[PDB]
Amino acid sequence: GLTEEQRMMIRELMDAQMKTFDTTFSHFKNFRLPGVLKVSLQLRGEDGSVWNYKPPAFSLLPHMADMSTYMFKGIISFAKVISYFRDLPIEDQISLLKGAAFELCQLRFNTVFNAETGTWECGRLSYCLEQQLLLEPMLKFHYMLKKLQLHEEEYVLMQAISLFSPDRPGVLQHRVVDQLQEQFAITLKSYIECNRPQPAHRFLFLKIMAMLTELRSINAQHTQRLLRIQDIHPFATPLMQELFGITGS
Amino acid sequence: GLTEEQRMMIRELMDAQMKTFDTTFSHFKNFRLPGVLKVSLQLRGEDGSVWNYKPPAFSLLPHMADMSTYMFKGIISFAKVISYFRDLPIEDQISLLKGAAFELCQLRFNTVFNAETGTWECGRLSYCLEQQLLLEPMLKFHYMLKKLQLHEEEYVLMQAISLFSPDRPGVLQHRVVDQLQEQFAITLKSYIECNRPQPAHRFLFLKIMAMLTELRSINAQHTQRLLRIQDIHPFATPLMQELFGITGS
Numbered sequence: 422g423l424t425e426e427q428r429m430m431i432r433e434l435m436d437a438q439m440k441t442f443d444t445t446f447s448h449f450k451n452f453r454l455p456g457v458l459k460v461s462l463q464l465r466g467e468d469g470s471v472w473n474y475k476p477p478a479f480s481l482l483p484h485m486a487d488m489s490t491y492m493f494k495g496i497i498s499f500a501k502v503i504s505y506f507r508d509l510p511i512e513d514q515i516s517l518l519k520g521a522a523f524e525l526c527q528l529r530f531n532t533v534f535n536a537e538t539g540t541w542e543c544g545r546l547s548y549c550l551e552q553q554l555l556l557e558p559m560l561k562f563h564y565m566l567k568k569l570q571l572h573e574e575e576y577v578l579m580q581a582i583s584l585f586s587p588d589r590p591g592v593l594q595h596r597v598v599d600q601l602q603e604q605f606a607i608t609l610k611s612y613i614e615c616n617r618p619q620p621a622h623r624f625l626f627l628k629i630m631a632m633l634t635e636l637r638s639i640n641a642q643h644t645q646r647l648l649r650i651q652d653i654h655p656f657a658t659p660l661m662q663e664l665f666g667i668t669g670s
Numbered sequence: 671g672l673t674e675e676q677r678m679m680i681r682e683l684m685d686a687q688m689k690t691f692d693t694t695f696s697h698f699k700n701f702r703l704p705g706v707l708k709v710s711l712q713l714r715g716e717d718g719s720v721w722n723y724k725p726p727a728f729s730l731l732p733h734m735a736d737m738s739t740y741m742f743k744g745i746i747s748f749a750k751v752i753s754y755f756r757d758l759p760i761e762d763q764i765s766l767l768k769g770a771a772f773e774l775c776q777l778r779f780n781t782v783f784n785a786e787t788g789t790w791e792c793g794r795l796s797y798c799l800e801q802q803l804l805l806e807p808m809l810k811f812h813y814m815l816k817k818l819q820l821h822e823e824e825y826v827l828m829q830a831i832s833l834f835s836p837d838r839p840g841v842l843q844h845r846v847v848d849q850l851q852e853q854f855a856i857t858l859k860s861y862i863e864c865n866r867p868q869p870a871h872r873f874l875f876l877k878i879m880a881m882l883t884e885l886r887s888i889n890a891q892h893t894q895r896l897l898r899i900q901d902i903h904p905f906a907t908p909l910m911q912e913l914f915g916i917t918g919s
C-alpha cells in the first residue's frame with residue numbers, strides 16, 4: 422500500500438513532468454535539417470503538407486543535436502521544479518544533470534516511440550527506422566522498455582532514480598542523493614505491487630531496475646561515441662558542450 | 671528529300687538547342703520551396719539522399735515560378751542564338767518572345783516528361799503527378815504530344831514555328847516572320863516524310879501543326895489564369911513580370 426508520503430512524491434513528480442514535457446513538441450522550431458541507423462525524417466506541415474527525408478549511403482547530426490538540446494532543456498526544467506532537487510547544493514545539481522541528461526532524454530523519448538512501426542512520434546516530426554539489428558544497444562533498449570508497457574508514474578519515477586544517482590562524478594552530497602534515490606525506488610517498488618498484481622508484472626520492479634543499469638552503460642558508451650565524432654566533426658551545441666564538458670577551447 | 675538549305679536550318683536549330691537547353695537542370699539552384707494538380711516534389715541530393723514533398727488540402731507557386739524563370743532564361747538564350755531571330759528588329763524580338771515563352775517552355779518540358787509514370791524528370795528534381803483527369807488541357811497536351819514520340823529535330827522545329835509567329839501582338843515585320851515560319855513548317859513537313867514512311871506517322875505533320883494551335887490557346891488561357899492568381903497573391907518573378915507585361919506598379 423502507498424503511504425501519504427509516497428503519494429506525495431509521485432504527485433510532485435507527475436506535476437513537474439506535465440509542466441516540463443511538451444509531448445507534442447509544439448515549441449520546437451528553427452531547427453537545422455539535412456540540406457538541399459537509417460532514420461528517415463518526416464515533417465507534417467501545419468497546413469497539411471508533408472516533407473519526407475530519406476538518408477544516403479552524418480548530415481542528420483546538426484538536427485539530432487538540436488532535438489537533443491530541446492529535449493535536454495525540458496529535462497532541466499524538470500529537475501529544477503522538483504523540491505528534492507532544488508534543495509541540493511548548486512554544484513551537486515550540475516553534477517547530477519551532467520550525469521543523467523542522456524538517460525532522462527531517452528526515458529522520455531521512449532514514451533513517444535512506437536514499437537509496432539519502429540518510429541519516434543514527436544508531434545509534427547517523425548523519426549522512422551529504415552529488424553533484428555536490435556544488435557544496437559540503444560535500440561534493443563527502446564523495444565525492451567516499450568514492451569514493459571509502463572504507466573506515466575513509473576516513467577517519472579525511473580527519471581527520478583536516474584537523476585538522483587549518488588554514483589556520479591563530482592556529487593558532493595553523496596549521502597543525501599543516496600537516501601533520496603532509495604526513497605524513489607521504494608515508492609516505485611510499492612506502486613508496482615499496489616497496481617499490478619498480474620503474473621505478467623512479476624519482477625517488474627527488478628526489470629525496471631536492471632534497465633536503468635543497462636541504460637547507464639549505454640549512456641557511458643554513447644557519450645564516448647559522441648565525443649569522438651565531435652572531435653573530428655564538431656556538431657554539438659553550446660548546451661551539449663556544457664553537458665559533455667567542452668570548454669569552447 | 672531535304673535540301674541543303676533545310677539541312678542547314680535544322681542544324682543551326684539543333685545547335686542552339688544543345689547550347690541553351692540544360693537537360694539535367696544542373697545550373698538551377700537557390701530556388702524557393704514550400705516551406706517548413708496534386709504535384710509531389712522530389713529532390714535527389716548530390717550525396718544520395720532524397721527530400722520528398724507531398725502537397726496538402728498555392729504554396730508551390732514561388733518554386734514553380736523559379737523553375738519557370740530558369741526555363742524562360744534558356745528559351746531566350748535559344749532565340750538570341752538563332753540567326754533568323756538575331757536579324758530581326760529588337761522590338762520584334764521582344765514581341766515574339768513575350769508571345770511564345772510559355773509555349774517554348776512547355777515544348778521543352780515535354781521532353782523530360784514521362785508518360786508511363788506521369789512525372790517530369792528534371793535532373794535532381796522531380797515533379798510527380800499525384801487518371802482520366804487529363805480533363806486538364808495542359809495535361810492532355812503533354813500526354814498527346816508525348817505519344818507522338820517525336821525526335822529532337824521535330825521538337826526544335828516546333829519551337830521555331832511557335833517562336834516565329836506573325837500572329838502575335840506588336841509584331842512589326844509581320845511579313846518576314848510569316849515567310850520564316852512557313853520555311854520552318856516546310857522543313858518539318860519534309861523531315862517527316864524523309865524519315866518516317868510508316869503508317870503510324872501518316873498525318874504526323876498535321877497533328878504537330880494542330881498541336882501547336884491547341885498549345886496557343888492553352889497559352890492564352892493559362893496566361894489569364896496566372897494573371898488572376900498574381901492579382902490576389904503576387905508570386906511572379908521580375909522576369910515573368912516583364913514577359914506577362916507587369917510594370918512593377
Ligand SMILES: CC(C)=CCC1=C(O)C(CC=C(C)C)(CC=C(C)C)C(=O)C(C(=O)C(C)C)=C1O
Binds near residue numbers: 548650
Ligand atoms: C535519429 C534518432 C532518433 C536516433 C539516432 C541517434 C540518437 O538519437 C542518439 C541515441 C539514441 C538512439 C540511437 C535511439 C542520441 C543523439 C544525440 C546525442 C545527438 C545517438 O547517440 C546517436 C549516435 O549516432 C551516437 C552513437 C553518436 C544517434 O545516431
Ligand SMILES: CC(C)=CCC1=C(O)C(CC=C(C)C)(CC=C(C)C)C(=O)C(C(=O)C(C)C)=C1O
Binds near residue numbers: 709734790
Ligand atoms: C508543378 C508543375 C510541373 C505544373 C503545375 C503548373 C504549371 O507548371 C503551369 C502549366 C503547366 C502544367 C499544368 C503542366 C506553368 C507554371 C507556371 C507559369 C508557374 C501552370 O500554369 C500552372 C497553373 O496552376 C496555372 C493555371 C496558374 C501549374 O499549376
